[PDB]
């Protein structure tokens, strides 16, 4: 997250770090949100790959012992059936990951709240991204959870030619696009927390930003619109 600030240890307790085996040690590669105690929501393209995955909940500094961490393996990856690795811009960039045992909840570990199916935000909605991704284009990972105020840019505006054109669709959400603050690599798969009727809920999963760079004016960070995939989520979880 470029242009962020570091978050307080207990603000965003559904935040997770998704990591791989890197071999001898582990390496953050994306974010995720805790949505059940044995289930996490992240982006299909962060689990595209043949690596071993773990998840870390109660994580504030990726280095440094926090005193609050729980580390749990991933048992089972369900990618959207229509995701195609070649095409982030088609959408479906969404995956659920079954953990090997359920985490315990506390003040640093909590379940993400999901929007009602179908909800769409007004323009210029209040929303935060959070993550450990690069703090500059072609920079380095934060060591501490960062967060950045990114309000929404609605589908017609984000849709216009001066912004994403065509490449956005309506199964997606745009937020930011001011030139200063944005998502960046290593924030992929994590939450976009929006304020709606006094409670924060997770309305996006971080997907993509532009090839010219992370914080570019008029190319907002783009995310999977959670509210288009409610029924898919609940059907996976039901099934396993």
Tell me the binding residues for Ca(2+): 59, 61, 64, 69
From the CB of 58, what's the least distance to Ca ion, in Å?
Answer: 8
Which of ligand FR1, Ca ion, none has residue 210 at its interface (CB below 5 to 8 Å by kind)? Answer: ligand FR1
Nearer to ligand FR1 among residue 38 and residue 175 (C-beta): 175
Residues of this chain that bind ligand FR1 (CB under 6 A) = 30, 45-46, 88-89, 133, 166-167, 183-188, 206, 208-211
Q: Is 6 in the site for Ca ion (CB under 5 A)?
A: no
From the CB of 227, what's the least distance to ligand FR1, in Å?
Answer: 19
Q: Is 178 a catalytic residue?
A: no
DSSP string, the chain: -BT-EEPPTTS-TTEEEEEEE-SSSEEEEEEEEEEETTEEEE-GGGG-SS--EEEEES-SBSSS--S--EEEEEEEEEE-TT--TT-GGG----EEEEESSPPPPSSS--PPPPPPTT--PPTT--EEEEE-SBSSTT--B-SB-EEEE--EE-HHHHHSTTTTTTS--TTEEEE--SSS-B--TT-TT-EEEEEETTEEEEEEEEEE-BTTBSSBTTB-EEEEEGGGTHHHHHHHHHH-
Nearer to ligand FR1 among residue 116 and residue 211 (C-beta): 211
Q: Is 28 a catalytic residue?
A: no
Which of ligand FR1, Ca ion, none has residue 183 at its interface (CB below 5 to 8 Å by kind)? Answer: ligand FR1
Q: Which residues are annotated as a binding site?
A: 59, 61, 64, 69
- Give the tokens for residue 41: 């929501």
How many amino acids of this chain bind Ca ion (CB under 5 A)?
Answer: 3
Report CA-CA distances (Å) from 70 to 23, 56, 60, 185, 199.
20, 6, 11, 24, 26
Region from 66-74, 161-169, 195-203, 211-219 binding Ca ion, contact rule CB under 5 A: 66-74
Given the residues 14, 28, 93, 207, select the one marked as catalytic.
Answer: 93
Which of ligand FR1, Ca ion, none has residue 61 at its interface (CB below 5 to 8 Å by kind)? Answer: Ca ion
| Interface pick for Ca ion out of 36, 37, 54, 66 (rule CB under 5 A) | 66
Residues with Cβ within 8 Å of 234's Cβ and at least 6 positions away in sequence, in order, are none
Nearer to Ca ion among residue 64 and residue 234 (C-beta): 64
Q: Is 61 in the site for Ca ion (CB under 5 A)?
A: yes
Per the CB < 8 A criterion, the answer to whether 229 and 93 are in contact is no
Nearer to ligand FR1 among residue 89 and residue 195 (C-beta): 89
Q: Is 93 a catalytic residue?
A: yes
Catalytic residues: 45, 93, 188
Q: Which residues lie near Ca ion (CB under 5 A)? A: 61, 64, 66
């Amino acid at each position: 997250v470029v242009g962020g600030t570091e978050a307080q240890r207990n603000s965003w307790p559904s935040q997770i770090s998704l990591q791989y085996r890197s071999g001898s040690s582990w390496a953050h590669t994306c974010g995720g949100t805790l949505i059940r105690q044995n289930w996490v929501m992240t982006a299909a393209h962060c689990v595209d790959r043949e690596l071993t995955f773990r998840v870390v909940v109660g994580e504030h500094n990726l280095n440094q012992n926090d005193g609050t961490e729980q580390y749990v393996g991933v048992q089972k990856i369900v990618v959207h059936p229509y995701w195609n690795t070649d095409d982030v811009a088609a959408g479906y960039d969404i995956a659920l990951l079954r953990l090997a045992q359920s985490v315990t909840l506390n003040s640093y570990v909590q379940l993400g709240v999901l929007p009602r199916a179908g909800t769409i935000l007004a323009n210029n909605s209040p929303c935060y991204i959070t993550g450990w991704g690069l703090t500059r284009t072609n920079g380095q990972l934060a060591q501490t959870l960062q967060q950045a105020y990114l309000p929404t840019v609605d589908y017609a505006i984000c849709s216009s030619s001066s912004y994403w054109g065509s490449t956005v669709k309506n199964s997606m959400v745009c937020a930011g696009g001011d030139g200063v603050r944005s998502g960046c690599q290593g924030d992929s798969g994590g939450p976009l927390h929006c304020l709606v009727n006094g409670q924060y809920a997770v309305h996006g999963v971080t997907s993509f930003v532009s090839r010219l760079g992370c914080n570019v004016t008029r190319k907002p960070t783009v995310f999977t619109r959670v509210s288009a995939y409610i029924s898919w989520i609940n059907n996976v979880i039901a099934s396993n």
